[PDB]
Amino acid sequence: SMLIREVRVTPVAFRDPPLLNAAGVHQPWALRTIVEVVTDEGITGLGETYGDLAHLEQVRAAAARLPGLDVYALHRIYRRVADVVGANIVTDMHGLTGSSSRVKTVDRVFAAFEVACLDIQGKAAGRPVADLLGGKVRDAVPYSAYLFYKWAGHPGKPEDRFGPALDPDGIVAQARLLIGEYGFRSIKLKGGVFPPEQEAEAIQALRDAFPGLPLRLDPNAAWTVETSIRVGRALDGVLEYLEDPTPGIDGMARVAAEVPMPLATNMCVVTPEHLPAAVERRPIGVLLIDHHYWGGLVRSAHIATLCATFGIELSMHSNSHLGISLAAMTHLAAATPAITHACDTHTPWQDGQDVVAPGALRFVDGAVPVPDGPGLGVELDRDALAVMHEQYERCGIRTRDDEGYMRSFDPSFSTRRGFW
Amino acid sequence: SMLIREVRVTPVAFRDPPLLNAAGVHQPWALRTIVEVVTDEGITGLGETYGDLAHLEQVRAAAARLPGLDVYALHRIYRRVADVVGANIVTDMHGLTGSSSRVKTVDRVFAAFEVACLDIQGKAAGRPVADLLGGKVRDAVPYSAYLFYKWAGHPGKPEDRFGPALDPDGIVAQARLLIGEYGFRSIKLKGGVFPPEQEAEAIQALRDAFPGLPLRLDPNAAWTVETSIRVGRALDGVLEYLEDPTPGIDGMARVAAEVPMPLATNMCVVTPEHLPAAVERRPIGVLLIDHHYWGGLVRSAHIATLCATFGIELSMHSNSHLGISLAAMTHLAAATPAITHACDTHTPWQDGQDVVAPGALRFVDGAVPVPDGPGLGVELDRDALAVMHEQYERCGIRTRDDEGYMRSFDPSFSTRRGFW
Ligand SMILES: [Mg+2]
Ligand SMILES: [Mg+2]
């Protein structure tokens, strides 16, 4: 039958190091919302989405209105989510995934349920979710090493095992650590933190220390058009791609026409309404897809086809996340021929924290093998979920705010947008 | 397990009346190829594609190379088809579905297998194919009445029950007949047969006889740009859309900018490589999708999303076909929010001929209810299949050739392309 009997919604918080970015610095707790869909038959599916309060409220509201719907009825579930969301538009405090909009809000709320319904469908059919998307075309999905400038620890808290990284030597050392542990064969540096000249230096140091590894640089729109063109030209032959150097479709397109490497985004093209203007102006050669705000795995796959058709290559964006998201990202990437670049992930930074069981997701030579077995291939660890929910209850954070947190230390700071 | 054990490929021929079009006249037999996929477990799926010899040869070749592959492994099946097809490009004799190309050839061969694999997946899960595409968003799929100018019968053969239609009165009478039987609430006229002024007259006669019913006119590119603009303007406020008035993206875009109704095509945009040029020039407001040459139901659904995003509405193209195709068309349309116009079908012209059982596909008030039960919801009638295969064996036709057939009667005829 496969009617939804109940939907359990659990906000969670987990530890995050002081990773610097254009919007400030990550807070000591990152938030997520875990969704568990249960059918009248007792088959369960998992999904995972943002933990910000306004989003959480919508997810709760939508979840309350899904019982009685069938898990194959994704169009109808999507319409029900759209009804709950109405014209409410949920906007985050950092802008690092671009502008908010109605459709993006609906897609963000829908995605945790869609992923859980696909998990259930996979379980019913006894197949991995990748088989629901046409079957895996690769056995394992390569991920990049996501490097950050960072403090040694959060002020007023213990220093972490990763150490500080505030110049090229530190960044190279961080890379050795991550590549040594996970085997990553691609490297991404989060920029927009230091003057561009210093971040270019870090990129060069990485190229020298790791010959042959594709490199990416992402200042989250911290640069002007002129600065972007200077840096792009100065990094000729070094970057796989330059990600969001400058804000806006117009600025991005102007940069793209004057630098030698392709530009990528997860800021100026973040919902389907953006695509026609993007095809016309060509601000990018590479779109980072993200099922968490493009509306689930199936909608993401549709956009992948659309991109390939217009000659836009695909990569994948990440936000701090747990293993349900990692499993979903991996089945999506494994089953989508057009996702050809290494995917981003924050996984190393969460240092083993998770709400699923241990032996399903592993990195081997920088890549995650598509899970064995039905559905997502992961199993909820209910005690770990309880532990993280208790942390959410007393962590004192309810909405991600990198900028507010940075301002607690430097009152004059503001999110860097066309700043250098 | 769901490994393909065998694939049965059966060419069939069935009776077709002398329907006139820009390329001449339909021959007395229409050809199709029926595909039946059988898993190691004995679960069967059906697909249906063109019967032209060169296509049939590719379908046979591909079918021989599918055993051992899993029915969920659609990406891998697609790659295997691409391997079999190589750089062979199969081109038909009439051009009524636009130019041939490698991808289109691969998609045409792949589609009969994809539809059969989805039928099997639906059977395994006990769900209709529409549930594999997100669930039906409408209970029944509206179809148009497909009107043709036609002779009373094929020369040297018995006249058919439909009668001749060679002027506006005849066309209106044909419409009364079809609408009376099937309940169609939209009307399409096949043109490019008579001078445009006479076909415009038929369109006007239809509007007067059937107030409120959307009307379409399709001359299959028989007109020049100037003639197209004249007719378009003369039919202001009458047409839902004007379909392929003139050949080529350039000509279509020039017409589209000077006529009051949207243009549609199944000739200048017929494979994904066409879409970027189409988005740039805007030759159309409406694309007729057709899973038989866009590469199956899932790929068709992807293109539907792409169209909606760029503001191109969707309709559906038909070629003479049987109930496996009708079932597939109906599940696709029912599960695709963007397919909003009535779909085309040749069903009435086949006057009950079919290779599936009787009680699954019916027209009620012009629309086909999505079938009840698992998979496509149709059951092969093996005796009917044998009957039509025996007809193929002795029908003396191996490739559709409307133009050659018309030339047997009028040696000076040539397919009309920018002729009026
Ligand atoms: Mg980015
Ligand atoms: Mg047409």
Residues of A in contact with B70 (CB under 8 A): 131, 135
Residues B335, B340, B342, B345, CA torsion sign: negative
DSSP assigned state of B158: P
Would you give the end-to-end CA distance of chain A in angstroms? 58
Alpha carbon separation from B102 to B58, B64, B106, B278 (Å, rounded): 13, 20, 6, 19
CB neighbour list of residue A175: distance below 8 Å, 6 or more residues apart: A145, A147, A187, A206, A209, A210
Separation of alpha carbons A217 and A294, rounded Å: 23
CA distance B46 to chain A (A): 18
**A346 CA to centre of ligand 1 in angstroms:** 12
The pair phi, psi for residue A230, each rounded to 5°, is -60, -50
User: Which residues of A lie inside 8 Å of B (Cβ-Cβ)?
Assistant: 70, 72-76, 121, 124-125, 127, 131-132, 134-137, 272-273, 275-276, 279, 298-299, 301-303, 305-306, 309-311, 335, 337
Cβ atoms < 10 Å from Cβ of A410: 10
Contact assessment for residue B194 and residue B170, using Cβ atoms and an 8 Å cutoff: no
Write out the two tokens for B279.
């988005």
Contact assessment for residue A332 and residue A343, using Cβ atoms and an 8 Å cutoff: no
Coil, strand, or helix at residue B101?
coil
Alpha carbon separation from B360 to B142, B176, B183, B376 (Å, rounded): 16, 25, 17, 10
CB neighbour list of residue A271: distance below 8 Å, 6 or more residues apart: A98, A101, A103, A104, A107, A293, A294
Sheet holding A215-218, edge to edge: A145-148, A187-190, A215-218, A239-243, A263-265, A286-289, A313-316, A339-343
Write out the two tokens for B341.
């116009």
Contact assessment for residue B7 and residue B66, using Cβ atoms and an 8 Å cutoff: yes
Distance of CA B358 to the CA centre of its chain: 21
* Active-site residue set of B: 190, 317
* β-bridge mates for residue B263, sequence order: B242
Distance of CA A140 to the CA centre of its chain: 18
Residues B253, B301, B190, B232, CA torsion sign: negative
Radius of gyration of chain B (CA): 20
Coil, strand, or helix at residue B123?
helix
CB neighbour list of residue A4: distance below 8 Å, 6 or more residues apart: A37, A38, A39, A40, A66, A67, A68, A69, A70, A71
Nearest to A325 by CA among A146, A112, A90: A112
Nearest to A23 by CA among A402, A413, A317, A409: A402
* β-bridge mates for residue B9, sequence order: B35
* β-bridge mates for residue B31, sequence order: B13
Nearest to A31 by CA among A86, A89, A94, A85: A94
CA distance B305 to chain A (A): 7
Residues of A in contact with B137 (CB under 8 A): 75-76
Q: Supply angle C-alpha B49, B50, B55, rounded to 5.
A: 105
Separation of alpha carbons A175 and A186, rounded Å: 10
Domain residue spans of chain A: 1-133+377-394, 134-376
CB neighbour list of residue A112: distance below 8 Å, 6 or more residues apart: A33, A35, A47, A48, A49, A59
CB neighbour list of residue A383: distance below 8 Å, 6 or more residues apart: none
Residue B243 annotated as part of some ligand binding site: yes
Sheet holding A4-15, edge to edge: A4-15, A29-39, A44-50
CB neighbour list of residue A109: distance below 8 Å, 6 or more residues apart: A49, A55, A58, A59, A62, A81, A84, A85
Nearest to A306 by CA among A270, A268, A279, A342: A279
Coil, strand, or helix at residue B28?
coil
| Residue written as token pair 């000509």 | B251
Q: Print burial letters for B346-364: b (CB count within 10 Å at least 16), e (below 16).
A: bbbbbeebbbbeeebbebe
Q: Supply angle C-alpha A330, A335, A338, rounded to 5.
A: 100
Separation of alpha carbons A294 and A276, rounded Å: 16
The amino acid present at B228, given as its one-letter code, is S
Size of interface A-B (CB pairs under 8 A): 85
CA distance A348 to chain B (A): 31
| Residue written as token pair 């660890």 | A381
Q: Name the residue of chain B whose CA is nearest to A127's CA.
A: B72
Coil, strand, or helix at residue A313?
strand
Stated resolution in angstroms: 1.6
For the domain spanning A134-376, the CATH number is: 3.20.20.120
Q: How many residues does chain B have?
A: 420
Separation of alpha carbons A235 and A253, rounded Å: 18
Cross-chain CB nearest to B306 (options A75, A137, A309):
A309
Which method was used? X-ray
Nearest to B361 by CA among B342, B340, B345: B345
For the domain spanning A1-133+377-394, the CATH number is: 3.30.390.10
Interface probe for B, chosen from A71, A310, A332, A340 (most Cβ of B below 10 Å), is A310
**Same fold flag, A1-133+377-394 and A134-376:** no
Q: Is A137 within 8 Å of B299 when comparing Cβ atoms? A: no
Helix (H) / strand (E) element for A43: namely none
**A218 CA to centre of ligand 1 in angstroms:** 5
Contact assessment for residue B317 and residue B115, using Cβ atoms and an 8 Å cutoff: no
Residues of A in contact with B134 (CB under 8 A): 72-75, 298
* β-bridge mates for residue B215, sequence order: B187, B239
Residues B126, B130, B134, B140, CA torsion sign: negative
